[PDB]
Design an enzyme around this catalytic site. Structure first.
Site, short mmCIF file in Angstrom:
data_model
loop_
_atom_site.label_atom_id
_atom_site.label_comp_id
_atom_site.label_asym_id
_atom_site.label_seq_id
_atom_site.Cartn_x
_atom_site.Cartn_y
_atom_site.Cartn_z
N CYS B 101 10.53 53.43 47.52
CA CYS B 101 9.86 53.70 48.81
C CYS B 101 10.69 54.80 49.48
O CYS B 101 11.69 54.52 50.17
CB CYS B 101 9.77 52.45 49.67
SG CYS B 101 9.02 52.78 51.29
N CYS B 104 11.15 54.40 53.33
CA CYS B 104 11.76 53.20 53.95
C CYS B 104 12.20 52.23 52.86
O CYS B 104 13.37 52.40 52.44
CB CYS B 104 10.82 52.52 54.97
SG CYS B 104 9.16 52.12 54.42
N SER B 105 11.39 51.26 52.41
CA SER B 105 12.04 50.32 51.46
C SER B 105 10.96 49.45 50.80
O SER B 105 11.29 48.48 50.07
CB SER B 105 13.03 49.41 52.17
OG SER B 105 12.33 48.62 53.14
N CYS B 106 9.71 49.79 51.05
CA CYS B 106 8.60 48.98 50.57
C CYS B 106 8.71 48.56 49.10
O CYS B 106 9.05 49.38 48.22
CB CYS B 106 7.29 49.76 50.80
SG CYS B 106 7.36 50.32 52.51
#
Ligand SMILES: [Fe+3]
Ligand SMILES: [Mg+2]
Ligand SMILES: [Mg+2]
Ligand SMILES: [Mg+2]
EC number: 4.2.1.84
Lengths: 212, 197
Positions: B101, B104-106
């Site tokens: 991601c 961000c961090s999905c």
């Protein structure tokens, strides 16, 4: 928003701090670290105060140097707190009083967002598409490396979701769109300066147009 | 002068946010403790490993997982937050898939577990989209010339898992034995399953 969070393709970073299958420790490395996601879900699902999209955008709105020096879970403490103040639920005064010191928040938004586009196309697997050459100062789920680039549709989702550029600002006009797995050749995104093969970006319908 | 802003300790800020909300009756009893338990004990890469081992030993399930990952995961009851629309992507002798991601961090939380610090790092977010072969090599995974690397950037609501190739030396293993060599890093795509010697 062309913020520092749009990191793909930035050069100058060192090694990823991991070797495969190394011990990553516990899920939470501090006793507070479960709070940002849990309180986000309180906000989304119990209070209805904001969307997950609004959480992504408020983190993007951290002042850029602040973003770059803040560990991951702390960014979401700051983001959730910021939304609770902006929505009128909490005050910064009470947060600082409870915290015993400064609790700087993300910066105010400089865009009201934009609605789901009224004119879009339903694309089919195998079609060539170009990412619309548009600049959006508020929330958008298009990383800049693919802006204006051409790729091929590998999947159209069977579900639809609110357009991030609207719901990330709490607007009432986010509608619903499917997204598309768009495959780009690595050279289309980074020219000769890449060692990869292809990159697949999951792009809302409203970010795309027919190629040529 | 580019200096950091003054800030109270992060623990104090995080618990201040909790107390401010809780003290207004906005946090149900047991709520954040319940989520911590879900995050720690239910969302887990052992679930993605179970799905991989099933796909490796059941051609019918493999085909469902690759065509309708949401339906396949739902048969196991593993849909959840950040894991409601699932797509599994298949490694092959000419293709290695990797997930990130960059914004961000999905991550597919219920079947991969919450992402680790390294996946959320700026180094991984910046670099794997542009130089995934070098990133994987530095991490300890050599991907030969002959193999296309394909990076999936998780930018919307699709949540991905990699279906790695099944390694030689595991013919006839039980699903439990196979599950054991499918690690979190194999599901993200930075590692290849390893057979002891
Ligand atoms: Fe993310
Ligand atoms: Mg940029
Ligand atoms: Mg710090
Ligand atoms: Mg003040």
């Amino acid at each position: 928003m062309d913020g520092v969070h749009d990191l793909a393709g930035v050069q100058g970073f060192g090694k990823v701090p991991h070797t495969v299958n190394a011990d990553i420790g516990p899920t939470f490395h501090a006793e507070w670290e479960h709070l940002p996601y849990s309180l986000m879900f309180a906000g989304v699902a119990e209070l209805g105060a904001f969307s997950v999209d609004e959480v992504r955008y408020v983190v993007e709105r951290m002042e850029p140097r602040h973003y770059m020096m803040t560990p991951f879970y702390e960014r979401y403490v700051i983001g959730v707190a910021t939304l609770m103040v902006e929505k009128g639920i909490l005050t910064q005064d009470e947060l600082e009083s409870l915290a015993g010191g400064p609790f700087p928040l993300s910066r105010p938004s400089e865009s009201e967002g934009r609605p789901a586009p009224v004119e879009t196309t339903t694309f089919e697997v195998g079609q060539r598409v170009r990412v619309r050459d548009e600049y959006v100062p508020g929330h958008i789920r298009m990383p800049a490396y693919c802006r204006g680039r051409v790729g091929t549709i590998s999947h159209r989702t069977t579900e639809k979701w609110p357009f991030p550029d609207a719901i990330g600002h709490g607007r009432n006009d986010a509608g619903e769109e499917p997204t598309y797995h768009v495959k780009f050749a690595a050279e289309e995104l980074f020219g000769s300066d890449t060692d990869g093969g292809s990159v697949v970006v999951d792009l809302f319908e409203g970010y795309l147009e027919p190629a040529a | 002068e580019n200096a950091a802003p003054a800030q109270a300790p992060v623990s104090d800020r995080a618990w201040a946010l909790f107390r401010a909300l809780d003290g207004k009756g906005l946090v149900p009893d047991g709520y954040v403790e319940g989520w911590k338990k879900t995050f720690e004990e239910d969302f887990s890469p052992r679930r993605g490993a179970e799905l991989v081992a099933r796909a490796w030993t059941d051609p019918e399930f493999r085909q469902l997982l690759l065509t309708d990952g949401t339906a396949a995961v739902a048969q196991y009851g593993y849909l959840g937050p950040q894991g409601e629309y699932i797509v599994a992507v298949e490694d092959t002798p000419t293709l290695k898939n990797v997930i990130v991601c960059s914004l961000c961090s999905c991550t597919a939380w219920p079947i991969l577990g919450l992402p680790p610090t390294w996946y959320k790092s700026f180094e991984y977010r910046a670099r794997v989209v542009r130089e995934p072969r070098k990133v994987l090599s530095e991490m300890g995974t050599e991907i030969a010339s002959d193999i296309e690397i394909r990076v999936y950037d998780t930018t919307a609501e699709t949540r991905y898992m990699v279906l790695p190739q099944r390694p030689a030396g595991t013919e006839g293993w039980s699903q439990e034995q196979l599950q054991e060599i499918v690690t979190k890093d194999c599901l993200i795509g930075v590692a290849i399953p390893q057979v002891p010697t």
